[PDB]
Amino acid sequence: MVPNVVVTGLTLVCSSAPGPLELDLTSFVLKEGVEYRIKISFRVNREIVSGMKYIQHTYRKGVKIDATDYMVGSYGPRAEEYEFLTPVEEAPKGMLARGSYSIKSRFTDDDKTDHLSWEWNLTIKKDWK
Template sequence: MSELNTDHVDSVEEELEVESNYKPPPEKTIEQILETDKEDESLRKYKETLLGEAKSGGVVVDPNDPRKVIVKKLALCVADRPDMELDLTGDLSQLKKQTFVIKEGVSYRIRIDFIVQREIVHGLKYVQKTYRLGVPVDKMMHMVGSYPPKTEVQSYTTPTEDAPAGVMARGSYSVSSLFTDDDKHEHLKWEWSFEIKKDWKE
């Protein structure tokens, strides 16, 4: 979002094309991971610590939800201000009616809160496309990583970015967000919007 120009969009598209040649390693069960190098005591203990609850058998937080990844919340985080949050557990079609107001030029980060249950998820990614008046102006992709199942909410926070500034940058934007993984599973896809203003209370 910080660049807001088509060059940025083109460069990200090129990165995604390069990435499409990447073949993720085959998925392994928790048992297979623990079996590998089991004669190495220090490595075995490290993996057991890393996997935590997962090694004791499938962690199921919500038995009525068959998904491996349950995306709970998106938060827009700005230093010294309360987080602006989107609840992603309800009616996603209503999110577009809730518009974040962002002061131009401010530094911000995006945090995604999610639950992983049942089994390890490999190569999670957060992809965000930003539009203005229906025209794509920015696209970014963040590698979130691989996560074991846990009863607690896990989080990923993007690196700091700067909102665009200036008269031409002010206005309304729509965003399409996708939480996916190496196997192209769409764990959640949603749309939301924000408005860049000269000041927070304008």
């Protein structure tokens, strides 16, 4: 009944951030310039899965301004939830770069299996809130 692969959540790891930046998968405000990593949480319940891949399409006011592909790897079943972390990123800085961004995320693997496709927003401001 429960799928073999289940994406549990997307988290924005940010030390300076004053509060939670979590998204349970079962908008985000980021102060310009700050460093962060995207942490995708998932579970492999029964079988080995290979070539896990995180895909991200960043949109601005309806138009694609960027696409990036992250290789997650191969995992075997286990009770502990898995934690994928992208490399450290820096939120753009500048009045021209501030504003909201739409993100289309996709967790896939060697099948092209749509384990989960979710969408979320990332708003960049001068200060937290």
